[PDB]
Structure formats: C-alpha cells, structure tokens
Amino acid sequence: LQEMKDIGVQADANAEMRARERRDRLHEALSVNRSRVNQLEKQIAFCEA
C-alpha cells in the first residue's frame, strides 16, 4: 500500500481502459499523419524532378 502511495498514480480501472484507448488512438493518428506527410513530400519531390 505504501508502494502504491509512492507510485502516486490513480490508475483507476475505468481511467486505465479509457487512457489506453485514447493514447493508442493518438499513436495511430500520429503514425498516419506522418505517413501522409511523407506521401506529400514525395509528391513534391516528383514535381521538382
């Protein structure tokens, strides 16, 4: 319990599931946005060439 107090994380079960869901959707959104950026950059490079 002391250890628990130490860690200092509420870590509620509902909070846990919600948080993991939101942060994972953030991860995938980030990856997809980066892929879009790469695609547009390659298109621009093709235009220059």
Automatic annotation (TrEMBL):
Where does this protein reside within or beyond the cell? Cytoplasm, Nucleoid
Please, which domain of life does this record's source organism belong to? Answer: Bacteria
Domain comment, as recorded: The hinge domain, which separates the large intramolecular coiled coil regions, allows the homodimerization, forming a V-shaped homodimer.
Quote the function comment for this protein: Plays a central role in chromosome condensation, segregation and cell cycle progression. Functions as a homodimer, which is essential for chromosome partition. Involved in negative DNA supercoiling in vivo, and by this means organize and compact chromosomes. May achieve or facilitate chromosome segregation by condensation DNA from both sides of a centrally located replisome during cell division.
According to the record's subunit comment, the protein's assembly and interactions are: Homodimerization via its hinge domain. Binds to DNA via its C-terminal region. Interacts, and probably forms a ternary complex, with MukE and MukF via its C-terminal region. The complex formation is stimulated by calcium or magnesium. Interacts with tubulin-related protein FtsZ.
What family does this chain come from, according to its entry?
A: Belongs to the SMC family. MukB subfamily.
Protein name according to UniProt: Chromosome partition protein MukB
Q: What is the originating organism of this protein? A: Photorhabdus thracensis
Per the UniProt record, the lineage of the source organism begins with: Bacteria, Pseudomonadati, Pseudomonadota, Gammaproteobacteria, Enterobacterales
